[PDB]
């Protein structure tokens, strides 16, 4: 699926 | 004499890059003048992302819980909104180096230099091609969204992507500035697909005619083709249709080396149907599509900024 | 996830940049503190070139005969010496945007990246290596000698790399900050060839494992094989010998992905036995020998600068 | 033969 890169 | 895939200078970009974090999120975001823009995504969290109403979580956030930091600055937000894709924050301070800049939507097969950054700190820089299916194949981790893609004309930027997310296979999707995704995706954890793509035949031109002024001439040959006769096997090879435009276009590069785009499309044609028989073109043993014309011209005769 | 030719930054490198000219002769020089570093043939005319005698022509010279430039500040002259094959000017104004910095020599098999310049301004950025012969596969014209190389540890930039000349076949060739050139080469219009140059099998192995990372495994078999074993392959191919202190570089890639090095080095054995068949490793055909173990673990872990 | 690069 489609995976959103934000980071923690 | 040589021939690299170059980027452009960065330095005008990294004076505008920062952190976002909303929570346990966080990502980059592009200072320009008292606004920040940021992929709207921070304002999730890990379980937010399957299916995100943006509005309603965005209804709960506070100036206050978005911390922008610029290096050691704290920046305050003073203000917030969500255009299309992009979180928009209004900072109480205007960027001291705020660039010349433009918004830009580019076409499929134009290029850019990509300023990879995490936690609002560059990593590296390097040129990719909008493909023809919208995506490009950068190198993103978690935490590079934000990072945004640019071309620079003299002192002007024109910025034209930001990064949101990666598809399967390993390419990557965004928005330009405007926050409107490239090509049919959306900003959710969801099954979306590249679809098919195809070889950028004006850009594999460009750098076969690279490869003739730097001195690799082995695989011109002797015939010339039409425009359509030569359309009928790039089809067949998944290669995008060369438009009378594009001939224009190679018009320039065709004139310095004195061979006509007509006769350059039959030695691809060749090469098409032949194989390169273990030979290599400008240290490559693959035909090259990221270079445009016009990033030949500049690589080529040393256009500055 | 992705893998690509990643450059450093250019920011901080790019404030450093001037344009330094002497009657018709003019190149790239670099702007550190109240000295300007640039090659000492800036000194010659172009019949000087075949054989200059550069301490004759440096007495002719005055401070004044020597044209700095940053941008559209004309810097005045106020010193020059030359130290090896570099003039160092020095300057009546400090630079101020100069960065934190280190002269460094590298060793071949080393990468770093060079800012492109001509008269004083950035063309592009990119990433080469330390040739094994000590040359570099650059791009460069006419106007780009005094052109840089750098690598950046967070906030220090080490210089490693100044531009002067282009030997046959498209090669590049270029001394230390110091003014020292790197491999048997001299600023001479002269006959000079670049020796015979061999594929970096560390950084071979390093690419690998990159693929590995980034999930293209198929060259992957079940063998293992000795060390002296397979510096009897690698040999035959024109491949360094692989050395105990490379295996021990290549330890955290190792570590990362579960796969010790000398079992790489099978796989990579049978790569140079048998070829590809037509497959890709990270999108290329052949194997890529210039990302270096550090520069595959900073773009696979994304360290910042 | 080498050639320098500087530029006119
Ligand atoms: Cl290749």
């Known amino acids: 699926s489609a995976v959103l890169q934000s980071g923690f | ?305």
């Open chain 2, 1 to 305: 004499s040589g021939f690299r895939k170059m980027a452009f200078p960065s330095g005008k970009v990294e004076g505008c890059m920062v952190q976002v974090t909303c929570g346990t999120t966080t990502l980059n975001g592009l200072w320009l003048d008292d606004v920040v823009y940021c992929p709207r995504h921070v304002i999730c969290t890990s379980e937010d992302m399957l299916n995100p109403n943006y509005e309603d979580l965005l209804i709960r956030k506070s100036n206050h819980n978005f911390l922008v930091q610029a290096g050691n600055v704290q920046l305050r937000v003073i203000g917030h909104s969500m255009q299309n894709c992009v979180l928009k924050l209004k900072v109480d301070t205007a960027n001291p180096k705020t660039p010349k800049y433009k918004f830009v939507r580019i076409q499929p097969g134009q290029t850019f230099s990509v300023l990879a950054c995490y936690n609002g700190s560059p990593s590296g820089v390097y040129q990719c091609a909008m493909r023809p299916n919208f995506t490009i194949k950068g190198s993103f981790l978690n935490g590079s969204a934000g990072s945004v893609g640019f071309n620079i004309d003299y002192d002007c930027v024109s910025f034209c992507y930001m990064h949101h997310m990666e598809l399967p296979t390993g390419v990557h999707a965004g928005t330009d500035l405007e926050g409107n995704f490239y090509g049919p995706f959306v900003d959710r954890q969801t099954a979306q697909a590249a679809g098919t793509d195809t070889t950028i035949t004006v850009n594999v031109l460009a750098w076969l005619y690279a490869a003739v002024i730097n001195g690799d001439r082995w695989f011109l040959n002797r015939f010339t083709t039409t425009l359509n006769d030569f359309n009928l096997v790039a089809m067949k090879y998944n290669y995008e249709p060369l438009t009378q435009d594009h001939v224009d276009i190679l018009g320039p590069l065709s004139a310095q080396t004195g061979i006509a785009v007509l006769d350059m499309c039959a030695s691809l044609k060749e090469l098409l149907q032949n194989g390169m028989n273990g030979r290599t073109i400008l240290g490559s043993a693959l035909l090259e599509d990221e270079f445009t014309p016009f990033d030949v011209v500049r690589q080529c005769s040393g256009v500055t900024f």
